[PDB]
Each structure stands twice: as structure tokens, then as C-alpha cells.
Amino acid sequence: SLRQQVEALQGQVQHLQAAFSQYKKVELFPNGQSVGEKIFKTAGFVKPFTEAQLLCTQAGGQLASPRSAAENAALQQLVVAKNEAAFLSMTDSKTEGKFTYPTGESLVYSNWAPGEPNDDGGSEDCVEIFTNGKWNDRACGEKRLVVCEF
Amino acid sequence: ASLRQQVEALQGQVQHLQAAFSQYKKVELFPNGQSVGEKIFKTAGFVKPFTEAQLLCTQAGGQLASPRSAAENAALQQLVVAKNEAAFLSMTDSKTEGKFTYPTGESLVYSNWAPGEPNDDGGSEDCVEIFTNGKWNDRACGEKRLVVCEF
Amino acid sequence: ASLRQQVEALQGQVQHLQAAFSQYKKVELFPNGQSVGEKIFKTAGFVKPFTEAQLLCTQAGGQLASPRSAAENAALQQLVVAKNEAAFLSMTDSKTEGKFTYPTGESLVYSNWAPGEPNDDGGSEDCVEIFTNGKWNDRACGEKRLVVCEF
Numbered sequence: 097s098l099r100q101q102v103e104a105l106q107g108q109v110q111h112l113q114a115a116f117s118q119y120k121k122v123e124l125f126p127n128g129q130s131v132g133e134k135i136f137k138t139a140g141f142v143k144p145f146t147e148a149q150l151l152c153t154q155a156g157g158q159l160a161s162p163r164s165a166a167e168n169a170a171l172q173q174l175v176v177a178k179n180e181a182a183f184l185s186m187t188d189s190k191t192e193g194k195f196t197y198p199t200g201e202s203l204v205y206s207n208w209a210p211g212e213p214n215d216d217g218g219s220e221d222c223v224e225i226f227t228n229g230k231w232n233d234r235a236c237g238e239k240r241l242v243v244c245e246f
Numbered sequence: 247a248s249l250r251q252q253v254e255a256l257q258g259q260v261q262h263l264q265a266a267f268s269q270y271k272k273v274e275l276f277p278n279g280q281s282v283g284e285k286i287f288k289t290a291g292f293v294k295p296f297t298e299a300q301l302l303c304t305q306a307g308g309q310l311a312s313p314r315s316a317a318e319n320a321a322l323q324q325l326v327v328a329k330n331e332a333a334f335l336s337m338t339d340s341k342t343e344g345k346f347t348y349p350t351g352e353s354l355v356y357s358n359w360a361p362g363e364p365n366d367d368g369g370s371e372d373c374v375e376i377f378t379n380g381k382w383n384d385r386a387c388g389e390k391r392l393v394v395c396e397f
Numbered sequence: 398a399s400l401r402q403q404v405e406a407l408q409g410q411v412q413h414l415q416a417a418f419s420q421y422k423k424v425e426l427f428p429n430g431q432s433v434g435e436k437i438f439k440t441a442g443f444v445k446p447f448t449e450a451q452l453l454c455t456q457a458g459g460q461l462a463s464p465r466s467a468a469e470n471a472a473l474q475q476l477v478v479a480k481n482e483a484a485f486l487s488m489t490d491s492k493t494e495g496k497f498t499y500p501t502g503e504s505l506v507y508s509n510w511a512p513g514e515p516n517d518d519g520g521s522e523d524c525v526e527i528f529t530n531g532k533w534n535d536r537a538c539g540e541k542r543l544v545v546c547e548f
């Protein structure tokens with residue numbers, strides 16, 4: 097009796113593994129990118145930084161925080177697909193010239209475009225990622241593609 | 247004996263699925279879904295008249311948004327606010343004027359009518375819209391409102 | 398005693414996972430997907446030329462929509478109708494004019510050609526579109542059509 101029910105449970109789990117794997121592909125198409133244990137997903141619209149940040153946090157995630165070249169490339173895929181530069185999570189709102197993650201931690205990876213960050217006009221504390229994957233500091237009030245990470 | 251090996255094998259596979267799925271739930275509901283209790287609301291992101299909206303939801307295996315508590319109403323309001331578009335609810339007094347019912351025919355267990363509503367304005371409001379402030383208003387079923395289904 | 402109850406507990410967990418997964422699957426497919434048998438169609442919601450469309454689907458781990466039966470065709474037609482945009486299918490006769498094949502090179506097992514089609518109009522129609530009425534027409538691959546992938 098026990099072997100009969102373990103065999104049934106094995107069939108259930110194998111079915112679930114197959115169905116779940118299929119569903120993951122469906123979900124990520126066309127607005128998500130999985131890299132390592134992280135998933136980026138775009139909302140497909142633009143918002144100013146504060147509104148974008150709230151959308152991600154309320155969804156149970158945070159704004160895209162690429163922490164390696166591989167993460168940056170995956171994010172860049174969404175930016176290229178939508179043809180809209182995106183906000184990253186990181187700001188120097190606390191200490192000018194020192195960019196940090198929302199937790200307050202200093203950057204462990206950067207991909208700044210030449211000459212950046214430059215606090216242009218003395219008022220750029222947010223960060224956008226271009227279709228070329230490079231970063232530029234930009235005014236937080238500008239509207240950029242919303243991309244969150246989970 | 248070898249069944250012990252198997253049960254321990256399944257425990258590991260189940261743990262992986264639970265964890266992987268937990269992450270995908272959050273991803274999936276961003277930005278057009280809202281979970282509340284065991285219910286999930288999901289917007290199509292566009293507007294339709296009632297009959298068309300109803301059909302979309304039922305064909306998808308769900309039904310138009312049917313908030314049955316203040317908590318559900320607040321969750322739905324989150325999507326309405328996010329989209330900045332009033333939505334249809336499932337409920338109508340199409341069968342008996344003045345008596346609003348769910349698609350099953352059951353009477354309301356919860357309502358959040360704006361003051362003075364429902365008023366059957368012009369003698370022809372049999373559907374219900376939820377505003378960005380979360381209040382309800384009866385409205386002509388012919389009007390186009392945000393499509394939000396529950397699953 | 399220990400092993401039988403572990404089976405019982407583990408199966409309650411799997412069945413709760415099955416239920417949650419089923420719910421999240423319905424949510425996922427509303428409004429841009431359709432399931433039919435073991436196949437799932439999902440639209441990107443925009444138009445692209447064939448080569449671009451094909452690449453999007455393959456990069457996503459699927460392929461362009463490839464209806465292999467009347468039931469599959471009807472499922473796909475729902476999305477086309479919902480978007481009101483004709484969609485590319487995966488199949489082409491680029492290799493041998495007049496002989497439409499799937500990406501694997503296999504000849505068609507199902508077709509739903511509109512009257513008069515395929516006609517290779519202008520001498521250069523090697524891709525396939527599906528209309529809102531579910532019928533197919535051969536069309537120039539350079540044209541832009543709704544992107545619908547299957548998984």
C-alpha cells in the first residue's frame with residue numbers, strides 16, 4: 097500500500113516539476129529575465145524614482161539592483177527590448193558622491209558611462225541604465241522605465 | 247528501506263518547488279495583480295463594457311472582481327488606484343431592480359456604496375463601479391470600465 | 398508509523414502546491430495567454446517582422462505559435478481576436494517554395510488556409526499569418542504581425 101502511494105506522490109511531484117518549469121518560461125515572456133537566483137521584471141511603463149521605488153517595494157521586491165556584470169546584462173536585455181532607459185535602486189541622496197543600495201550599503205559593482213556620475217547641475221542623485229548597459233546619474237524626478245527585482 | 251530513500255528524495259524536491267514558486271508568485275503579480283487572503287485580483291489593464299468584461303473573466307476561469315469584505319475591497323482599490331481607472335464589479339440588479347446580487351444569485355455580504363448610492367440614475371444603472379477612493383456607485387452597464395477579474 | 402505519516406504530510410503539501418499552482422496558472426494566462434492540452438500560447442502584445450518574432454520566442458525557450466489541430470487553432474484565434482491583430486505562425490516555405498514546414502523541417506500536419514491561399518502573392522510570401530477569423534494566409538516575412546509564442 098505504501099509503495100503504491102509513494103509512486104503516486106512521485107508522479108505528482110514529477111508532473112509539478114514539468115508544469116512549473118513550463119510556467120516559468122511563460123511568466124518571464126516577454127517582461128522578465130532570470131539571472132542566478134534573481135529575477136528582473138519590467139512594469140512596461142515609466143515613473144519618477146519615488147513612484148517606481150514604491151511600486152517595487154509594495155510588490156514585495158525592490159528596484160533593479162545589478163550587482164555583477166551578469167546581472168547588468170540581464171537587466172540590459174529588458175531595457176533594450178522596451179527601448180527605454182530604467183531606474184536602478186541606488187542613490188547618493190544621503191551623502192553626495194557616495195552611491196548606496198536602499199539598505200545603505202555601498203556599491204559592490206558599478207558600470208558608469210564615461211565621466212559619470214557627474215551630479216549634473218548639482219542635482220542628480222538617482223541612476224539610469226541605458227540600452228548600452230552603461231549607467232548615468234540622473235535627476236530623481238525624471239520618468240524612467242520601472243524594473244523591479246525579486 | 248528504499249522507500250525511505252524515496253520519501254527523503256521527494257522532501258528535497260518539494261522544498262525546491264515551494265521556494266521557487268514563492269518567488270514566482272511575487273513576480274507574476276507585479277504589476278497587475280493583488281493577493282488578499284486566498285483570492286487574487288488581476289487587471290487586464292484596459293476598459294470594456296460590463297458584458298464584455300464579464301465574458302473575459304469567465305472564459306479565463308474566474309469572474310469579475312467581487313469584494314466580499316473590507317479587506318478585499320481595499321486590495322481591489324490598490325489596483326484601481328495604480329491604474330487610475332474605476333473598475334466594474336461582478337454584481338448587478340439586472341434581475342430585480344434594487345436587489346444587487348453576485349453572478350450566483352446570492353445577495354451582497356458586503357458593500358461600500360458612496361453616499362446616496364445606488365440611485366439607478368436615469369432609471370438605467372444596473373452595474374457597479376469601484377472608484378479610486380474605494381467607494382461604489384451603480385452605473386450603466388453599457389459604460390466602459392477597467393476590467394479586473396478574481397481567481 | 399514514521400514513514401507512512403511522512404507520506405501523508407508530504408502529500409498534503411504537494412496537493413496544496415497543486416492547488417496554488419492551478420490558481421496562479423489561471424492568473425498568469427489572463428489576459429495574454431491561452432492553454433490548450435499541454436501547450437500554452439502567450440502573446441507579447443506587440444507586432445514584429447518574422448525574424449524578430451521568431452528570435453523573441455526562441456530566446457524565451459519556446460517557438461512561434463504552431464497550431465497542430467483545430468483545437469489548437471481555436472485557442473490561438475482567441476488571442477488574435479482579443480488583440481485584434483493577425484499573428485505570425487512559425488511555419489515557412491523558404492526552403493522549398495509551396496511546401497510549408499515547422500522550424501524542425503517537418504511538413505504540416507494541420508492547416509487552415511483561407512480560400513485561395515497559400516498563393517505566394519507577388520512571388521514572395523514565405524511566412525504565415527492567422528487572421529481574427531482563425532484562417533491562414535501566406536504573407537511576406539518582412540511584414541509586422543502580432544508576436545505569439547508557444548511553450
Ligand SMILES: O[C@H]1[C@H](O)[C@@H](O)[C@H](O)[C@@H](O)[C@H]1O
Nearest residue numbers: 212214216220232233234235
Ligand atoms: O545626466 C546628464 C544629462 O543626461 C545630460 O543631458 C548629459 O549631457 C550629461 O552628460 C549627463 O551627465
Ligand SMILES: O[C@H]1[C@H](O)[C@@H](O)[C@H](O)[C@@H](O)[C@H]1O
Nearest residue numbers: 363365367371383384385386
Ligand atoms: O449616482 C451618480 C450621480 O448621479 C452622478 O452625478 C452621475 O454622473 C452618475 O452617472 C451617477 O451614477
Ligand SMILES: O[C@H]1[C@H](O)[C@@H](O)[C@H](O)[C@@H](O)[C@H]1O
Nearest residue numbers: 514516518522534535536537
Ligand atoms: O493572398 C492575400 C490576398 O491576395 C490579399 O488581397 C493581399 O492584400 C495579401 O497581401 C495576400 O497575401
Ligand SMILES: [Ca+2]
Nearest residue numbers: 188189192221
Ligand atoms: Ca545630492
Ligand SMILES: [Ca+2]
Nearest residue numbers: 188215220221
Ligand atoms: Ca548626486
Ligand SMILES: [Ca+2]
Nearest residue numbers: 214216232233
Ligand atoms: Ca549624470
Ligand SMILES: [Ca+2]
Nearest residue numbers: 339340343372
Ligand atoms: Ca434595472
Ligand SMILES: [Ca+2]
Nearest residue numbers: 339366371372
Ligand atoms: Ca438598477
Ligand SMILES: [Ca+2]
Nearest residue numbers: 365367383384
Ligand atoms: Ca449611481
Ligand SMILES: [Ca+2]
Nearest residue numbers: 491494521523
Ligand atoms: Ca519563396
Ligand SMILES: [Ca+2]
Nearest residue numbers: 490517522523
Ligand atoms: Ca511562398
Ligand SMILES: [Ca+2]
Nearest residue numbers: 516518534535
Ligand atoms: Ca497570400
